[PDB]
Design a protein around this ligand. Sequence first.
Ligand code: A1AI6
Length: 165
Amino acid sequence: SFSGYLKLTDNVYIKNADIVEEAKKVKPTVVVNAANVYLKHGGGVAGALNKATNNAMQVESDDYIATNGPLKVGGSCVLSGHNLAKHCLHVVGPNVNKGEDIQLLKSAYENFNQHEVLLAPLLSAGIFGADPIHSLRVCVDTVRTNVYLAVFDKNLYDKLVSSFL
Ligand SMILES: CN1CCOc2cccc(NC(=O)Nc3cnc4[nH]ncc4c3)c21
């Protein structure tokens, strides 16, 4: 199961880890992708997860969009986890660098409540432009199911733990 995580709350855990390496080791039921509405997995966590699947995540995602159209900011869809997990929950947090409303971050984290346990990144963090400290606060105050947060950057991980209320 998940190992080496620091316990933040009754249901939220955190670790300084590369989510691709973590997913390959644990093979969780659900890995969360930091998706955009088009499921174009070019960079950030999405680019990394898609590269680990040898682009199979992108081929599946393009068929999903061709059939269903784009997701909503704050929405999600469940697709295959390929070689990383049973399922991938593609969640769209607001991208501050595209001028999207940070208030949609709580709606994005509500998608996690449909799954009993998840391996996830902090939504809207990294190249999505939000404050990761804020994202962790919204995560703890919204998600009720068991969430294992992987934070790639060691310096950010230390800042998140040391400033956690
Ligand atoms: C190095 N690993 C181990 C297993 O083999 C593969 C295969 C594909 C990708 C990676 N990891 C990766 O790209 N990680 C990555 C990058 N940028 C990122 N930005 N934000 C998160 C985040 C994660 C790995």
